[PDB]
Amino acid sequence: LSGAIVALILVIAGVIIAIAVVLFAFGLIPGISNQGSIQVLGSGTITNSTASGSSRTIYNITITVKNTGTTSISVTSININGQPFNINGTAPSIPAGRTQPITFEVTPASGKPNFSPGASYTATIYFSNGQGAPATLIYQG
Amino acid sequence: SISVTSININGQPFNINGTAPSIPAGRTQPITFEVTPASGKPNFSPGASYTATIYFSNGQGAPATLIYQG
Amino acid sequence: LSGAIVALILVIAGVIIAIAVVLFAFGLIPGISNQGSIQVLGSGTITNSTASGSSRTIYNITITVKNTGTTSISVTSININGQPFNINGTAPSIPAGRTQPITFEVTPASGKPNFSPGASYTATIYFSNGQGAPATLIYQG
Amino acid sequence: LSGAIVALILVIAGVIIAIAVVLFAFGLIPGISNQGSIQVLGSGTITNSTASGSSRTIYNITITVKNTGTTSISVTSININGQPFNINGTAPSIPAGRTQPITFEVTPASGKPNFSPGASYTATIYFSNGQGAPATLIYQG
Amino acid sequence: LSGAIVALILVIAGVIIAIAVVLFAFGLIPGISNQGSIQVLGSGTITNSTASGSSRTIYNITITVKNTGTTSISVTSININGQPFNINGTAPSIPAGRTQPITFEVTPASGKPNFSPGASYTATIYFSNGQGAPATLIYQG
Amino acid sequence: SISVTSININGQPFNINGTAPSIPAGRTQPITFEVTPASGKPNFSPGASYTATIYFSNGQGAPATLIYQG
Amino acid sequence: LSGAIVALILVIAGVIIAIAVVLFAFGLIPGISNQGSIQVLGSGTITNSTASGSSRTIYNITITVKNTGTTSISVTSININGQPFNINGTAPSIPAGRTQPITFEVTPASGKPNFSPGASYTATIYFSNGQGAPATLIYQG
Ligand SMILES: *[C@@H]1O[C@H](CO)[C@@H](O[C@@H]2O[C@H](CO[C@H]3O[C@H](CO)[C@@H](O)[C@H](O)[C@@H]3O)[C@@H](O[C@H]3O[C@H](CO)[C@@H](O)[C@H](O)[C@@H]3O)[C@H](O[C@@H]3O[C@H](CS(=O)(=O)O)[C@@H](O)[C@H](O)[C@H]3O)[C@H]2NC(C)=O)[C@H](O)[C@H]1NC(C)=O
Numbered sequence: 001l002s003g004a005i006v007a008l009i010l011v012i013a014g015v016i017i018a019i020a021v022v023l024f025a026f027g028l029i030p031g032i033s034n035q036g037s038i039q040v041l042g043s044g045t046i047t048n049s050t051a052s053g054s055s056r057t058i059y060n061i062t063i064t065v066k067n068t069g070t071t072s073i074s075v076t077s078i079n080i081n082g083q084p085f086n087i088n089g090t091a092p093s094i095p096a097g098r099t100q101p102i103t104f105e106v107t108p109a110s111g112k113p114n115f116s117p118g119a120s121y122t123a124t125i126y127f128s129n130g131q132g133a134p135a136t137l138i139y140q141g
Numbered sequence: 142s143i144s145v146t147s148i149n150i151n152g153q154p155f156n157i158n159g160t161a162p163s164i165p166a167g168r169t170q171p172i173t174f175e176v177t178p179a180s181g182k183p184n185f186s187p188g189a190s191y192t193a194t195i196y197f198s199n200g201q202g203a204p205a206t207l208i209y210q211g
Numbered sequence: 212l213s214g215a216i217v218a219l220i221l222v223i224a225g226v227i228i229a230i231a232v233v234l235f236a237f238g239l240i241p242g243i244s245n246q247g248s249i250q251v252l253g254s255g256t257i258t259n260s261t262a263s264g265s266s267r268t269i270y271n272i273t274i275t276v277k278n279t280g281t282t283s284i285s286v287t288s289i290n291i292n293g294q295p296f297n298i299n300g301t302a303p304s305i306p307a308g309r310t311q312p313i314t315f316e317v318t319p320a321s322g323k324p325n326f327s328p329g330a331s332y333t334a335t336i337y338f339s340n341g342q343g344a345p346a347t348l349i350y351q352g
Numbered sequence: 353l354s355g356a357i358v359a360l361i362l363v364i365a366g367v368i369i370a371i372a373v374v375l376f377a378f379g380l381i382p383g384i385s386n387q388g389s390i391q392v393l394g395s396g397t398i399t400n401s402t403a404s405g406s407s408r409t410i411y412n413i414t415i416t417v418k419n420t421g422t423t424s425i426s427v428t429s430i431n432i433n434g435q436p437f438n439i440n441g442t443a444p445s446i447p448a449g450r451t452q453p454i455t456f457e458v459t460p461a462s463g464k465p466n467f468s469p470g471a472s473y474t475a476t477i478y479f480s481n482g483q484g485a486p487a488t489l490i491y492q493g
Numbered sequence: 494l495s496g497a498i499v500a501l502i503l504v505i506a507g508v509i510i511a512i513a514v515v516l517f518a519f520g521l522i523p524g525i526s527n528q529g530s531i532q533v534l535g536s537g538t539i540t541n542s543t544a545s546g547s548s549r550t551i552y553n554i555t556i557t558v559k560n561t562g563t564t565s566i567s568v569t570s571i572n573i574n575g576q577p578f579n580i581n582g583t584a585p586s587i588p589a590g591r592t593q594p595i596t597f598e599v600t601p602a603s604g605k606p607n608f609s610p611g612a613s614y615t616a617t618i619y620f621s622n623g624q625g626a627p628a629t630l631i632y633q634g
Numbered sequence: 635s636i637s638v639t640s641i642n643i644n645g646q647p648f649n650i651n652g653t654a655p656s657i658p659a660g661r662t663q664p665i666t667f668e669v670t671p672a673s674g675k676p677n678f679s680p681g682a683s684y685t686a687t688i689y690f691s692n693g694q695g696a697p698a699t700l701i702y703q704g
Numbered sequence: 705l706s707g708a709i710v711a712l713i714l715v716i717a718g719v720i721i722a723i724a725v726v727l728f729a730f731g732l733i734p735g736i737s738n739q740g741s742i743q744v745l746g747s748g749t750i751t752n753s754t755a756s757g758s759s760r761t762i763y764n765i766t767i768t769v770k771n772t773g774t775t776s777i778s779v780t781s782i783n784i785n786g787q788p789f790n791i792n793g794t795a796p797s798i799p800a801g802r803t804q805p806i807t808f809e810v811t812p813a814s815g816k817p818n819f820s821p822g823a824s825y826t827a828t829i830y831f832s833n834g835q836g837a838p839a840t841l842i843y844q845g
């Protein structure tokens with residue numbers, strides 16, 4: 001008798017644990033699937049903010065940005081002409097569903113830039129999502 | 142009627158501060174309860190997913206995904 | 212009489228041992244299921260730390276890292292351009308739920324690197340989880 | 353009794369094998385990087401190399417090859433104008449960090465090639481890291 | 494009395510068979526590696542090979558094949574342009590560590606192929622290690 | 635504490651010449667050991683990656699990827 | 705005595721059920737291929753279909769459709785250039801194995817479109833498989 005009752009328990013338990021894992025897999029879908037992103041529109045600009053012979057050079061990155069997602073997002077880094085820059089001061093944030101010009105200040109992480117007036121540099125902006133967007137910036141002066 | 146005995150979040154043990162919530166026979170419903178870390182200090186990040194396992198008075202444990210909203 | 216009493220004991224014992232194993236299987240789920248990981252954001256950089264004609268070359272790997280899990284984690288190895296490197300000095304550690312730039316020093320395990328200024332190398336960072344993440348590092352100089 | 357004891361063994365073994373496969377998937381990643389170690393720079397040259405009255409047609413091929421990996425790599429095959437060619441003698445190799453004009457001898461496998469002085473032929477070179485690369489070869493005579 | 498004595502035998506046998514199956518699962522793993530031993534390099538060539546007035550249409554096929562396994566491997570079948578082909582005579586083989594132009598004779602199984610001079614045909618070659626590989630073949634006439 | 639007992643690389647068996655190394659409980663380590671082919675010869679290539687399987691004293695084995703350095 | 709007989713029956717039944725599950729898995733493979741039964745080919749046209757200043761704008765969607773499936777399959781819905789539309793008339797249906805032109809009347813679900821002569825618009829047509837096919841319609845009206 002014993003063998004068949006044990007076999008039946010492990011069938012019923014097998015069904016329970018298997019269905020629990022299938023329901024778990026359906027529960028992941030809202031977290032992993034998430035349409036919409038920050039989009040970068042047109043060219044941006046770089047402007048020299050540095051003043052008074054200060055020890056650190058500071059630049060100004062103005063660009064037009066459209067958040068197509070359902071949540072507020074922020075910038076976290078920029079890379080320009082292959083060189084990393086830190087975003088000095090509070091990083092700006094783009095509300096859900098909104099198009100804005102945004103401006104923020106940056107400093108080189110190491111070395112110095114060699115920008116030229118009217119030249120165009122490729123840049124990559126990284127958002128709080130981990131998602132990044134390639135952009136073109138024109139150096140104004 | 143069956144009640145929540147314990148919860149573990151992302152491997153970490155947690156204590157249900159408030160009284161155990163209970164689900165009546167045959168019902169489907171939302172269930173809400175207050176919980177506190179058993180040790181240390183967690184740091185949930187907005188919009189990230191964590192796996193709870195909730196243990197009910199059957200001894201049955203169910204894995205579930207929670208998204209942090211705070 | 213004997214046969215039926217023994218048959219009944221082995222039914223009841225069968226139920227007990229089978230339910231004990233089902234409860235054990237539900238007890239594994241918190242250990243094996245563990246969402247969230249270390250995520251590597253944007254490009255990192257390599258910088259030459261070597262000095263004074265020393266016998267060992269030392270490099271600097273700076274990268275931005277986001278721990279989405281509920282526990283503190285550390286780096287344990289890096290492989291760059293197919294070559295293994297040791298993390299000289301205490302390996303850095305990323306607290307739960309936190310985004311950080313991290314920096315650590317490394318030395319080749321065998322041979323020598325042949326990095327070139329401004330070139331980009333694929334790398335893999337391995338964390339204490341056993342989980343690893345592919346990354347791109349730009350050699351600065 | 354037997355059924356539950358077997359279920360417990362297969363549960364624990366299942367966890368061990370599943371974790372091993374996940375770790376293996378992360379362990380592959382470094383090996384993918386090496387597939388791009390080589391590139392071919394500019395046009396190369398074909399030259400008829402065989403001695404007077406000799407049975408074998410043999411050609412000298414010269415190309416500039418750049419190696420960016422951490423190990424020496426060698427030529428393994430060439431396809432010229434669609435024809436597969438055999439490589440004669442020892443294969444050449446490119447040291448790990450270097451860019452060099454490389455020269456080697458080849459002989460046709462599929463039949464008789466009819467190169468014309470000053471004509472330009474496409475080729476694909478194949479290397480010991482499993483990479484293939486497009487090339488242009490000018491037949492000098 | 495009988496019932497308990499039988500239960501003891503089936504408990505011990507259960508442990509022995511369960512452990513044997515777990516060890517078998519680990520014992521499979523080496524055999525999986527060999528499935529990727531071969532790759533086909535560049536275009537190959539088809540050539541009409543049959544003698545004047547002969548009943549059989551027969552073609553010569555030439556391709557470069559690289560073997561990276563620890564054993565010799567042979568060609569077992571080819572499918573050209575969707576048609577299955579039969580292989581005539583002895584199959585060719587590629588020595589364990591080598592890259593070679595390989596030549597073999599084939600004859601159509603499914604009907605009459607109508608190759609056109611200079612046209613390019615996709616093929617799948619199949620090898621004695623159970624692997625299949627995509628190939629391109631240019632019909633020379 | 636556990637030890638290695640065999641390795642298979644690219645489908646070929648190898649013997650672990652000299653004392654097999656051993657890993658203490660709860661510990662992470664780089665380990666190094668020497669091996670010889672049991673039959674035939676390998677045909678490794680610099681920078682190429684080979685699948686391998688390491689077998690421990692448990693009978694448990696683990697798949698691995700090895701890069702041939704030179 | 706009984707325990708051994710029960711063990712034997714469950715061993716034999718185990719073999720049968722395991723084989724049945726393996727055969728069932730292959731039985732799904734033909735069924736899932738029905739998801740690809742329809743192809744939309746060539747380019748379609750869209751033309752004014754309303755008259756006499758009637759209250760509804762109505763149009764004509766002519767397309768060529770090939771059905772590779774074993775059953776007659778029908779148009780469930782259409783979306784034109786991102787906009788939802790309703791098929792006024794009864795759903796058209798494509799018989800098994802046929803290639804044919806298909807023509808049907810359609811109306812905007814909301815607002816007012818303004819197709820311009822000779823411009824191209826992308827329809828996606830959804831068939832009773834749940835399969836959706838993108839197609840280009842040129843406006844003729
Ligand atoms: C953005 O604005 C920044 C601040 O004005 C500029 O950085 C400053 O550049 C000065 C020289 O300018 C020229 O040369 C650069 C290459 O070195 C080039 O990128 C520029 O486009 C421009 O052609 C520099 O002056 C230093 O160097 C001069 C020689 O080049 C020398 O004459 C100066 O005496 C001085 O050493 C600034 O450096 C700082 O100068 C301070 C004195 S003063 O120059 O203000 O009178 C001194 O006290 C301080 O120690 C020294 O560091 C330099 N400023 C900084 C912070 O580095 C930058 O060029 C502008 N453009 C871009 C694209 O970044």
Ligand SMILES: *[C@@H]1O[C@H](CO)[C@@H](O[C@@H]2O[C@H](CO[C@H]3O[C@H](CO)[C@@H](O)[C@H](O)[C@@H]3O)[C@@H](O[C@H]3O[C@H](CO)[C@@H](O)[C@H](O)[C@@H]3O)[C@H](O[C@@H]3O[C@H](CS(=O)(=O)O)[C@@H](O)[C@H](O)[C@H]3O)[C@H]2NC(C)=O)[C@H](O)[C@H]1NC(C)=O
Binds near residue numbers: 268
């Ligand atoms: C990172 O920094 C490291 C330390 O400065 C660099 O390693 C050092 O490289 C020196 C040569 O530099 C050039 O050649 C390299 C290839 O060999 C190349 O990777 C570099 O990009 C660069 O073009 C080397 O100097 C040795 O070799 C010279 C010939 O190449 C020769 O002129 C020197 O006399 C010397 O032999 C360094 O080696 C060490 O040199 C000591 C004397 S001194 O050079 O400091 O004056 C000597 O006492 C010592 O025994 C010898 O080993 C070499 N240092 C080390 C520790 O290996 C490295 O190139 C930099 N870049 C990268 C990408 O790693």
Ligand SMILES: *[C@@H]1O[C@H](CO)[C@@H](O[C@@H]2O[C@H](CO[C@H]3O[C@H](CO)[C@@H](O)[C@H](O)[C@@H]3O)[C@@H](O[C@H]3O[C@H](CO)[C@@H](O)[C@H](O)[C@@H]3O)[C@H](O[C@@H]3O[C@H](CS(=O)(=O)O)[C@@H](O)[C@H](O)[C@H]3O)[C@H]2NC(C)=O)[C@H](O)[C@H]1NC(C)=O
Binds near residue numbers: 401404406409465
């Ligand atoms: C590479 O160089 C080799 C010599 O180093 C060449 O071999 C020589 O080929 C000559 C003809 O080449 C033509 O025909 C080939 C097939 O035979 C063909 O593959 C080539 O692409 C090309 O179209 C050959 O000349 C013989 O044949 C001629 C007719 O084809 C005839 O006019 C000649 O008189 C001669 O019989 C060479 O043979 C040698 O010729 C010597 C005299 S001379 O031709 O140098 O004036 C003669 O003394 C000698 O006995 C005879 O064998 C043959 N060998 C040599 C040493 O020249 C090979 O074709 C080259 N391949 C390419 C692709 O350029």
Ligand SMILES: *[C@@H]1O[C@H](CO)[C@@H](O[C@@H]2O[C@H](CO[C@H]3O[C@H](CO)[C@@H](O)[C@H](O)[C@@H]3O)[C@@H](O[C@H]3O[C@H](CO)[C@@H](O)[C@H](O)[C@@H]3O)[C@H](O[C@@H]3O[C@H](CS(=O)(=O)O)[C@@H](O)[C@H](O)[C@H]3O)[C@H]2NC(C)=O)[C@H](O)[C@H]1NC(C)=O
Binds near residue numbers: 399400412455456457
């Ligand atoms: C095809 O490739 C072959 C190698 O794969 C080449 O063989 C090499 O030929 C070099 C001289 O070739 C010159 O003269 C030919 C007439 O004899 C002419 O057809 C060629 O076009 C070319 O103008 C030879 O170099 C010798 O002369 C050099 C001075 O010019 C001197 O520096 C060298 O030391 C040598 O004496 C090559 O030399 C051999 O060199 C070996 C070292 S290495 O050159 O490979 O680095 C050395 O170990 C050996 O002892 C020596 O004999 C010679 N190389 C080989 C491997 O044989 C052939 O010329 C190429 N053909 C064409 C038409 O270009």
Ligand SMILES: *[C@@H]1O[C@H](CO)[C@@H](O[C@@H]2O[C@H](CO[C@H]3O[C@H](CO)[C@@H](O)[C@H](O)[C@@H]3O)[C@@H](O[C@H]3O[C@H](CO)[C@@H](O)[C@H](O)[C@@H]3O)[C@H](O[C@@H]3O[C@H](CS(=O)(=O)O)[C@@H](O)[C@H](O)[C@H]3O)[C@H]2NC(C)=O)[C@H](O)[C@H]1NC(C)=O
Binds near residue numbers: 542545546
């Ligand atoms: C591979 O090579 C074989 C010869 O080595 C070819 O066999 C020859 O095929 C000729 C026609 O080929 C065409 O028709 C085939 C079906 O018959 C078809 O499979 C081919 O793809 C191609 O479309 C055939 O020519 C005969 O038929 C012609 C009409 O189709 C007619 O115009 C000819 O006069 C002739 O009757 C060959 O037969 C031989 O022709 C000799 C004269 S000549 O044609 O060489 O000028 C004649 O003397 C002889 O009696 C007669 O049998 C036939 N055999 C030979 C030796 O040429 C085969 O088709 C090739 N396959 C491919 C794919 O290219």
Ligand SMILES: *[C@@H]1O[C@H](CO)[C@@H](O[C@@H]2O[C@H](CO[C@H]3O[C@H](CO)[C@@H](O)[C@H](O)[C@@H]3O)[C@@H](O[C@H]3O[C@H](CO)[C@@H](O)[C@H](O)[C@@H]3O)[C@H](O[C@@H]3O[C@H](CS(=O)(=O)O)[C@@H](O)[C@H](O)[C@H]3O)[C@H]2NC(C)=O)[C@H](O)[C@H]1NC(C)=O
Binds near residue numbers: 462463540541596598
């Ligand atoms: C299709 O494949 C067949 C093999 O599967 C080929 O048969 C081989 O033909 C070689 C010569 O072919 C040349 O001449 C043909 C006209 O007769 C022409 O149609 C071809 O396009 C090609 O130009 C033959 O090689 C001989 O000649 C060589 C010099 O060119 C010499 O080096 C060889 O030793 C040989 O004398 C092949 O030779 C046979 O070779 C055997 C060794 S191996 O070559 O297989 O390594 C040897 O054991 C045997 O005794 C000898 O007779 C010959 N191979 C076979 C197996 O028959 C056929 O040409 C291919 N057809 C085409 C159109 O390419």
Ligand SMILES: *[C@@H]1O[C@H](CO)[C@@H](O[C@@H]2O[C@H](CO[C@H]3O[C@H](CO)[C@@H](O)[C@H](O)[C@@H]3O)[C@@H](O[C@H]3O[C@H](CO)[C@@H](O)[C@H](O)[C@@H]3O)[C@H](O[C@@H]3O[C@H](CS(=O)(=O)O)[C@@H](O)[C@H](O)[C@H]3O)[C@H]2NC(C)=O)[C@H](O)[C@H]1NC(C)=O
Binds near residue numbers: 754758818
């Ligand atoms: C497809 O054909 C349809 C019917 O022929 C067109 O829809 C009808 O368009 C009439 C005017 O057409 C002009 O304006 C359109 C935008 O409204 C434009 O797309 C056309 O290209 C063209 O430039 C419209 O008539 C109304 O508006 C006129 C002014 O534009 C005015 O003169 C009329 O008196 C009328 O107010 C139709 O609306 C219908 O008109 C009926 C009277 S009559 O026009 O037949 O004399 C009226 O009884 C009815 O209530 C009113 O709805 C309009 N029909 C509909 C259903 O909207 C359509 O533009 C064509 N093209 C496309 C791309 O859809």
Ligand SMILES: *[C@@H]1O[C@H](CO)[C@@H](O[C@@H]2O[C@H](CO[C@H]3O[C@H](CO)[C@@H](O)[C@H](O)[C@@H]3O)[C@@H](O)[C@H](O)[C@H]2NC(C)=O)[C@H](O)[C@H]1NC(C)=O
Binds near residue numbers: 089
């Ligand atoms: C980077 O961000 C800092 C805040 O995160 C910001 O600090 C603020 O500074 C302003 C005034 O700064 C001026 O003076 C300093 C010298 O003290 C210069 O380096 C600077 O360029 C400006 O000219 C101050 O009003 C405010 O209270 C500060 N805020 C905080 C939170 O401390 C830095 O100024 C900024 N760096 C640059 C170069 O702008």
Ligand SMILES: *[C@@H]1O[C@H](CO)[C@@H](O[C@@H]2O[C@H](CO[C@H]3O[C@H](CO)[C@@H](O)[C@H](O)[C@@H]3O)[C@@H](O)[C@H](O)[C@H]2NC(C)=O)[C@H](O)[C@H]1NC(C)=O
Binds near residue numbers: 158159160
């Ligand atoms: C943790 O669990 C307790 C029981 O499960 C619960 O006690 C109940 O408390 C409410 C009123 O609590 C208020 O006042 C206390 C101070 O006494 C605060 O700490 C608390 O935040 C509230 O502001 C009471 O009406 C009820 O009868 C209690 N229930 C029982 C069974 O005793 C605690 O409230 C709960 N902790 C929190 C923060 O809610």
Ligand SMILES: *[C@@H]1O[C@H](CO)[C@@H](O[C@@H]2O[C@H](CO[C@H]3O[C@H](CO)[C@@H](O)[C@H](O)[C@@H]3O)[C@@H](O)[C@H](O)[C@H]2NC(C)=O)[C@H](O)[C@H]1NC(C)=O
Binds near residue numbers: 301
């Ligand atoms: C690798 O990590 C070591 C610690 O794990 C570290 O030791 C520390 O060294 C610093 C000073 O090191 C300098 O001098 C040595 C020669 O003695 C050079 O090799 C080195 O590059 C530095 O220039 C010392 O202050 C500190 O107390 C040491 N800490 C410990 C725990 O011993 C090594 O320096 C480091 N290697 C490199 C190359 O940085």
Ligand SMILES: *[C@@H]1O[C@H](CO)[C@@H](O[C@@H]2O[C@H](CO[C@H]3O[C@H](CO)[C@@H](O)[C@H](O)[C@@H]3O)[C@@H](O)[C@H](O)[C@H]2NC(C)=O)[C@H](O)[C@H]1NC(C)=O
Binds near residue numbers: 651652653
């Ligand atoms: C395989 O393992 C052996 C021990 O299990 C080891 O023996 C030791 O050998 C070393 C010195 O070996 C050198 O010389 C021999 C020739 O005699 C070479 O084959 C070898 O490659 C080395 O170059 C010796 O100091 C030590 O005492 C030996 N230990 C014992 C216990 O005998 C073998 O050397 C080793 N095989 C290889 C190839 O390393």
